[PDB]
Each structure stands twice: as C-alpha cells, then as structure tokens.
Design a protein around this ligand. Structure first.
Ligand code: SF4
Ligand code: SF4
Ligand code: FES
Ligand code: FES
Ligand code: FE
Ligand code: FE
Lengths: 634, 634
C-alpha cells in the first residue's frame, strides 16, 4: 500500500509507476537499510578518531565507554553539536553567497542583480545602525553587505544578525550564559575543535556550545532572508498552485531545486524571455516549477507553482515530463542523477561545491547570470524535443495555495484592522481566546514517517483548537499539498474563534473571505521571519519570548539544518517539538538537559514525540501553560 | 604480556601496577570494544541526517547505497572531509588563540606576555609584506596579529599563511586546481556545508575540497609556530630527558598536557618563582614535566623533560607521584578525570571550550596569567602535601634527549660548514649519497598498534639506509623515549654515510661528537617547520617539492589533526605514509584517488601500510624514485 509511504495521492500514483518500471526510490532504499544500526539511532557511536569506531551498548554489558574514556554523555553531545554546526554551515553559506552577490551588484560587477526592495534595504540599515541620510542607496547596500560578511568572523561587536534581531531582554539572558555568537564561521570551527578527540568532555559545557552555534545558524537564516528580500523583493500575498499536477505535458517543464534565489530568481525571469524560443521547439512555453526551498523562494515572490518537496522529490521525474532539474545545493537526493538516465530528465548542477556524478555541470556566475541561465534553459528545451511523442503520466492532482505571508505582509494585513497598532488585533484575539496561541511548522519530510502524516495530523488538531498556524520549508510544502493554504477550507479545518479572526482580517483586506487556514512564511531561512514576528510581539507586550504562547514543530525533521533550527527555537525561548528521534536517547543526562533543564537557561525546551496525536496534545499543553503564565483563560 | 600493549618498558611497568590496582586503562577500554564495527572501520557509515544511520556492506548484498542515494564513494569522501575540517579547526583554533594573545600583549592588556623573539617578528613581517622600517616593534606585531586573524575569513587576498610559505611554483600548481584556501574558518564551514545531506556528491570534487581544507590546516600550523616563536622564543638545541623516570618522588610533580604554550610557558616561568613556597610544603621544588604537544613546546624552548605521550598518558598518573595535570585542549583522554580519583592527582582544566566532568576548572585569562598560574600551582602543592608518606612507583627509566631543532637552528648548524650557503652542505650530501633522503615522522600513538612499534621499526630501517630523519609531536615522543635523540646512539643506529654527516655537522658546532640520530623539530603545529625546511631546499634547488627525496610517515596516527596533516603533506607534494587504516577502504575509487591519481594533481600521494617493515621498504622506494628523477644514484 503506497499510503504507508506517502499520504499524498500524487506521490502514491508515481510510486506505482516507479514500481512497475523498476526505478528504485528513497522508500526502497530505506527498506533495504532495515534494520538500521541501534548504536547510531541512539547516538552511542563515535568516529572522531582513528582508534574508533567506538560504540556504547544502550543497555547491558561492555562496551560501556569509548576507548579514550568518552562517556555516553560526551559522545551524544559531541555528535549533536557537529550536526548543529553543519546546519549552521549550510544556512550561513547560503547567506554568505547572497552577501557577495549584493556586493557585486552594487559595485557594477553583476548587472542581472539590483536593489529591488529599497524599503527593506533602508530598514535593515537602520536596524544595524548604518546611517542612511544623505547616502546613495548603492553605498548603503555596500555597507549592509560588508556588515553581513563581517558577522562571519570575530570583531569588536558580536554577531549583529543575532543581537539586533532579538529584544534586549532576550539578548541579556543569552549573554549571561555566554551564548551570543562571536562570529558565524568562528562558532562553526570552535564546535569542530571542541568536539574533536581529547577536547570538551562535559555534557553541559558541550551543549551550551551547541546552543551558541545554533544562534549562529539563526543569524545565517535571518541574514539570508534579509539579503534575498533586498535583491528579489519582500514577499506579499500571492495565489498559485501545488503538487505534481502543476506540470504540463505540452510545456518545457523546468524544476528549480535546492536553496538559493540567486539562482532560481534569474531562471524565472530569463524563462519568460525564452517563451518564443521554447515555442519554436514545439512547446507552449517554459513552465518553471519549484522543489524544496528554492521552490518556496520563487513561490513566495512570484507565485511559481510548487511541484513537490523533500522526500518525494524523485516523483517529479517519474512523471516523464520533467525536462530539467536545475540544482544549487542542499536537500537534493543524489539519486536524481541516476534516475535521470531512466526518465530522460536533464539534471544540471551549477555550484562549484555541490556536484553530483553523472549530472551535467553548468558553472553559474552571478557576473554572467543571464547568459548562464539561457545555456541551462536551452538544455531543457532540447530535452523537451527528445520526448516528442512519449506519453507522460502527470497525476491530475493539485491544490490552490495562497502564500506570501512575510512578516511585513502579516503586519500590513493586521493594519487593516488597526492602522497604527497592527499587532494589537492579533494580541486582542489571543487575550479573548479566539486565537489560543501560535504554532510554527518547520522542516523536512523524513522517509521514516509516512509523508506529511505528522504535519497534517498535528495541524488539524491545533486548528480545531483555535491555534494560529504558520509554516515554512517543507512543512509549508506538506500543508500546501493537503489544502491547508486554500481559504476555501477554513470552514472545514478551523475552530470557530480562529475562523472568526481569519475572516475579520480577510474581509478588512477586501477579500470577501478569510485568510487561508495556515500562513506560509516562506523557505527554511525564512523561519527568521517567524522570529521577527514573535520578537515584535514580545517587544509590543514588554515580555520575553519565553512568556509567549508560541511553539514550534519540526514534525518530520531530516536535515542537520532542521536540528540547528530546532535548537535555536529552544534557545530563543520556544517549546519545540521534534517528531523523529534525534540521536540522543542513548544518554539520559543529555535528553534531560534538552527536554527539561534547558528551560532554566533559555525558557525553551524540546518535546520529543513520535506519535503525532500525542504531540498535538503536548503542544497544546505547552501553549496553554504559557497562557496560564500570562493570567489568561485557556 | 604488556609488550603487546607498549614497547616502552616504563609503560609496561605502570600497566602492571594499573592491573593489580584495578584501574582501567585505554588498552582495557580497547579490548572491551572488540570486535569494532566493520562499517565504521571501512568508512561505510553515514549519520549526516535523521534518516540514518545508513551503512553499505563492503561486499555482498543490500544495503548497497545510502537512503538519499549517497554512494560508497560519496559517504567515504564526506566522512574524510569532515575529519580534515575538524583537524583544521583544532590547529587553527590554537593559532587563533596565540594571535589574540600577541595582540593583547602589544596593546598593554596582558603584561605576562611580550615579544621575546624580535628577529622572528621582523622576518615574519617581511615574509608577509608588512613594512618594518621606521616602525615600533609593538606596531609591527599588531600588524602581524591582525594579518593572522584576517586569514580566518575571506578578504582581497587568499590565506597568506599558505601563499607566502610555499614557493611560487607550488602555489601555481595548487591555484590551477582551485586548492588555495580563501580563509581558514571559511574553508572549515564550506566543508561542513558541502558534506551535509543533499550537497556535494562527486568523490573527486569532495576530495579537492578536502585538499583545500588541509591547506587551511597547514596555515593554522604555520601561524601557530610563527606566533609561539615570537611570544616564547624560537627553539635552539637543548639537552634534557624523557620518560616516566623524570618524575621525582620528593618534588611537586606537575604535568603540562594539551597544546598551547600560552598556558604551558607561563606555568614553567611561574613554577620557578614558587620554589620556596613548594619547599615550605616539604618538597624539593616544583618539577614541571611535559605530556603531548604542550610538553613538546616547553621541551623545545626550555628543556623541560617529557614525561610521556599520547596513548600512554594515563601511566604518568599510575605512578602515584603526579600531583597535578594542567590541561588546555586536544588529545587529553577524558579518562584522566576519573583515574585521578584513584591516584590522587589533581586534574585542572583551564579553557572555557574544553572541560571534563569531575576535573577542577580554573579559568585561565591571558590578562591574569601569572595570578591564575599561582592558583593552579598551589593546588598542586596542596596535593603533594596530601601524599606525604605514600610510597610511589616511578619506573627508574629515562633517556637523554637532544632537541630544539627549529628550521633556524638546522640552518645555523649547517652554516658552520658553509656560512653563506647553509643548505648546500645538506644538498651536497644528498647528491653524494651520504644522505639518501629525508623522512618526517609525525603524529600520534594509536591503541591498535603496540605503542611506538611502527615508529621505531621504520626509523631503524631508514637510518641504516642513510635517511636523515626528523620528527615532531608524539612521533618525536616515541623516538625520544627509545633513545633516538641521544647522540651516543649514532654508531648503533645510523648508516655510515649518515653518521659521517651527523659527525661533520656536530664537530663543526663544537660538540666533539655528532648531532643526534633524529632531529626533533617540535610539536605538531611545528610540522610547519619541516615545511619551511623543505620549501627552502626546493627554492635553493629551483625545483618544486614533488621532485625532492622527502617523505612523511604518520606511522601510528589517531587524531583528526593527524589526518589533516597527512592530507596537506600529500597536497604540498610528499609521499605520505599512514600506518593505521583511515576509514577509506570501503571505497576503491576513493582509495585510488588518495594513493594514486592525486599524484597527477599535487605530486604527493598516500601510502597506506600497516606492516612497518613493509612501510619502510615503500618509503625507501619513494625516496629512491625521487633520487632517480633527479638523476642521482640510489
Ligand atoms: S574520540 Fe574517543 S570515543 Fe571517539 S573514536 Fe576516538 S577513542 Fe573512540
Ligand atoms: S545523508 Fe544520506 S546516506 Fe547519510 S544518513 Fe542521511 S540518508 Fe543516509
Ligand atoms: S556502530 Fe552503527 S552508527 Fe557506528
Ligand atoms: S554502523 Fe557502525 S559506525 Fe555506523
Ligand atoms: Fe530547505
Ligand atoms: Fe598534538
């Protein structure tokens, strides 16, 4: 039964096709891996030196300790810290790329890029303390780019993409515990050092370092969103579609996959100039579709329809209609390069540090972006021509998606109810119980969990209990593909209080109907937008984030990046659910820190719960405990 | 039989004591780990996301590929790259600490530190291009410290502690392959990114990134040596002793253990001012002894005797006479904190990012170094008092050690034969066959190998074949403890040609006898001194390093740092032996790159050989192939 693999009907249909065609999928590779190693599952394995591999039995007799003397506590904490550092390295590497792109753009070195959002640029400069009065925009932008790059290393200030984005009282709590990062790449390196053999060997000390590195990840996320908004525009509400039915047999279908809008944004613009060239080849046009975060980026800004996400990404190929898959980095199953031989798809890498054996590599340079995009799209057009006459099987399955809810857009929507105190109508409805609290869904799909099952099960229970639900990344992807971003489903999905608020906001925005059930706040770096919203609420209320009825759920987490995000959610003060097991259960002391005693440090805490109906109850309890702490009914 | 555990008789004696006293050692923890996991041993395990753990059978049936599609090639290369990045993070973290210390010293913020080697400071400034004429030393030093810190991040120049230390022709080869690092912490982060899930998935591309990150490690090593020489003095020839017999029952015995001379150098100086305070407590004085690299640092500069190294570090404690073990970071078995409860030793950590549960922590600040050192040494004095009346068992085993052969010191010794062309007498004797070639022994001991057995077996064979042998780190430690640094053993150990050269140099230096059989070039960062010597020889000859009859051997390697060092030795052009299995054999394509096709990229290559008599033959063949390529007899 394909329903045990994915709850998405389009994915189920393509799983049937892959099976009859003998094309191995992620689910088949998972089945072939079972049973998985219990040492790795519990975190009780270490390969940090050539005396290893070392392992510790979770229970029973020897081995009980690593060869060097490393305890279970130490081994588990060191492994977790390296995962946080790896996640930080990815989000902040993405941000660094955008900083260099902005710098090039304003220095005259990359004319395909420009300041598109001047309002965003000036507001970021003001937040950072960079003067704007009497300065040319290009000079302000150069200073912002230089400040972004300076946050990667030690200097006379800490990381400003932490200290300028959280309220002073939160920064103070963190500073008292030594948790403010000194530099993003500095912290990543310090983790790698401290976790190497014969260094840090105290679980609490190790985990404090991990919390600090998670804040370096947050800075990378926030910097990425900031810079992408300057370069490509801050999102506003947009209407599009999702799921495999957005592919079109009669078009050149091009997926943008990976992460950085420096690549996907140009593919979108250049594809429109090439419509007549695609038509000369017998297509109707070029149909750009999204996969994973770079898909979210172009969905949020341009309404490009999302094809699929995360674990099911191979299924777009199995249709037979995917002419090209254009990749930068992160979250791309390398299986795509071999599946392409069977499906005909042209898989194209573009970044020097992210190649896949068997894929075609087209170097992308920001200095030649338009030229490089045309070379890529001409490969896609050629591939379309080669499938002239082949039947394709595109499931006729799609949902309507309203998205584009940046924090600026949410504030603007609320301002239609209260022009000069936009956050107040949200707060009023929390106080009166029409909004019980807020839950951010974030993160990936994971082959261990039937695809989307945790996201939808938890979201349904929260929505019925009047929780305002926001989402990013492939959590937003799951919810969009199951109709949670279609305002036509508000009546079915939402409790009466939440429906009343979504309707009041929507009617004030001229929609004649509500906002959607779930607000799509963007890509995974755009988890930083949720931070901006929550920090703005905390500041408006004069309380810290750990007193707000706000929770997060990485319900189906996979990537090291999702571990980093969950960790900074805890660090900034949120109850944070994770719906898969991180490799921590082999140490009860480490588990106790992450799920309990960190409350006394940051006010946040992990909630590890694999059963989604139980997870929803635990998330509601966390929200309601925060309501009670504010003196509110619940 | 303790000879299967260690070839060091003092270690054997303490293993007997530990056994009868029920104190578990590293060897016992290794026995309890057997059989070790074959997936980890071969590199065929991945835990880079929460879909894992993934494994690949080396041979047979499924699993054959990771869940995301990662091949054996990819998994092996990604794991290796993360080990290189971790090694870079340690050596360069050490260097960064020294850069901040020098900066503080010359800004008036840390008066226990100063410019001790003004000649070294000016020569480093000249090498970097920093002007010195008409500048105050403190201003030159501030500029050098600032340049050191700038090499950690991207800027308008590549990493100068690579490009200014290798000859232009070598830099050109590396640059053509994209291998020059852009910034030290930048490269570490880029490795962590590219090796995270769904990123780089091409073995050759991954390994090129690893070679580049290994050059970031080299820069950290060279920067560490440079800055420590400025602050603490460039080594010159010194005579001391090694092995456990350097402990003294009637003294306060204090081991300095870990890595950074910012800590050990001050412990040495302050201990002398506290002699009368130790005597009031009934001791003869404070006897500072070394373990691991920080021991090597104070041995090289001050003649502090070395107690033990690497795998046998617990044995110093088992004597019952070790009153304190003063730690900073790296290579410290965390077992020491629990062994201390049985032996009475006071284990003291000092660095915020390297704590050990159960050890006493005394924060060390460079701004208060002397005060903090006295607090630490008073704990040691108190511990001595508590063992009044307890028998101790110090093996009466020690060797004489001549050390202090910095590259400056080697050039100066050679200059007694040829004042204005000091390298020429060395080259002349290579040409005439009195010196067959040069071999650098480097790296750790590893519990899998009977301690020291590979270092001594290989060195004996090379010395008899007239190879000039230099050593660093715990390879120098092994050789010193077995008499290879005592000039009285030249007749026994050295071939006639090598004896003739060591005698000619020694007699010209007024010794009435030879240089020692092996030249101790210092700590592990001081592998950079061997680079300086080899680069100077290459420059004098007008050839690149990959034409010289110079090889390296990490004969008993353990730490991620040793993997990084071996990798940069290959990258700079050396045949590089490793005497333990790195986790690569699960991929034949990766093994073939590292042992064969990298020759076409850098001219260097790994020689993986666990049998030391065979390794010696392979190293001699590599030397002789280089002689033949220069047209020399062999
Ligand atoms: S660091 Fe310690 S626990 Fe890890 S592999 Fe090495 S000896 Fe084993
Ligand atoms: S990155 Fe790929 S091979 Fe590694 S644990 Fe995740 S699914 Fe498995
Ligand atoms: S023993 Fe299986 S993850 Fe290491
Ligand atoms: S399966 Fe043993 S190292 Fe992972
Ligand atoms: Fe993502
Ligand atoms: Fe060392």
């Amino acid at each position: 039964r394909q329903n045990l693999k994915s709850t998405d009907r389009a994915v189920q249909q393509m799983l049937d096709k892959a099976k009859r065609e003998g094309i191995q999928t992620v689910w088949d590779r998972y089945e072939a891996m079972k049973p998985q190693c219990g040492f790795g599952e519990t975190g009780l394995c270490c390969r940090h030196c050539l005396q290893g591999p070392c392992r510790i039995n979770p229970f029973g007799d020897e081995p009980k300790v690593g060869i060097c003397g490393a305890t279970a506590e130490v081994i588990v904490a060191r492994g977790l810290d390296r995962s946080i550092a790896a996640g930080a390295a990815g989000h902040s590497g993405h941000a660094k790329h955008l900083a260099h792109t902005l710098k090039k753009a304003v220095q005259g070195k990359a004319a395909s890029y420009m300041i598109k959002d001047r309002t965003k640029l000036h507001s970021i400069a003001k937040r950072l303390g960079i003067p704007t009065e009497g300065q040319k925009d290009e000079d302000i932008a150069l200073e912002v780019a230089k400040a972004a790059l300076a946050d990667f290393h030690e200097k006379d200030t800490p990381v400003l993409w932490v200290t300028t984005v959280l309220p002073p009282s939160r920064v103070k709590v963190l500073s008292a515990h030594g948790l403010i990062p000194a530099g993003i790449d500095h912290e990543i390196a310090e983790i790698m050092h401290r976790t190497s053999m014969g260094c840090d060997a105290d679980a609490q000390n190790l985990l404090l370092g991990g919390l600090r590195c998670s804040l370096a990840d947050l800075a990378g996320c926030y910097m990425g969103t900031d810079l992408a908004d300057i370069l490509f525009g801050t999102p506003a509400p947009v209407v599009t579609e999702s799921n495999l039915g957005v592919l079109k047999a009669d078009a050149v279908n091009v997926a943008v996959h990976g992460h950085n809008p420096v690549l996907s944004d140009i593919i979108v613009s250049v594809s429109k100039e090439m419509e007549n060239e695609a038509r000369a080849a017998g297509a109707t046009g070029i149909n750009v579709v999204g996969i994973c975060c770079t898909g979210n980026e172009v969905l949020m800004r341009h309404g490009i329809p999302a094809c699929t996400h995360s674990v099911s990404q191979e299924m777009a190929m199995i249709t037979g209609a995917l002419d090209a898959m254009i990749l930068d980095y992160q979250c791309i199953q390398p299986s795509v390069a071999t599946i392409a031989e069977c499906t005909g798809t042209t898989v194209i890498t573009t970044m020097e540090m992210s190649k896949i054996t068997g894929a075609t590599h087209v170097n992308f340079a920001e200095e030649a972006a338009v030229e490089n995009a045309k070379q890529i799209l001409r490969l896609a057009i050629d591939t379309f021509k080669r499938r002239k006459g082949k039947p394709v099987e595109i499931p006729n399955i799609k949902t309507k998606v309203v998205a584009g809810f940046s924090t600026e857009a949410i504030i603007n929507a609320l301002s239609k109810l209260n022009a000069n105190d936009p956050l107040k109508p949200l707060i009023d409805n929390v106080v009166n119980g029409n909004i019980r609290g807020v839950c951010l869904f974030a993160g990936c799909n994971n082959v261990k969990v039937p695809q989307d099952q945790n996201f939808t099960t938890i979201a349904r229970k929260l929505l019925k209990q009047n929780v305002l639900v926001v989402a990013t990344g492939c959590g937003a992807g799951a919810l969009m593909r199951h109709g949670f971003m279609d305002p036509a489903n508000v009546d079915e999905l939402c409790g009466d209080g939440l429906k009343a608020v979504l309707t009041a906001i929507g009617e004030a925005n001229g929609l004649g109907g509500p906002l959607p059930p779930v607000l799509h706040m963007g890509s995974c770096v755009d988890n930083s937008r949720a931070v901006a919203l929550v920090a703005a609420l905390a500041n408006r209320l004069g309380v810290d984030l750990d007193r707000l009825p706000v929770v997060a759920s990485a319900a189906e987490a996979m990537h090291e990046k999702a571990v980093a995000i969950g960790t900074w959610a805890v660090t900034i003060g949120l109850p944070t659910h994770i719906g898969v097991l991180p490799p921590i259960t082999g140490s009860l002391p480490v588990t106790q820190i992450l799920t309990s005693s960190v409350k006394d440090i940051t006010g946040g805490y992990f909630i590890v719960e694999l059963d989604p109906e139980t997870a929803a109850d635990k998330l509601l309890a966390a929200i309601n405990e925060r309501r009670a702490g504010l003196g509110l009914p619940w």
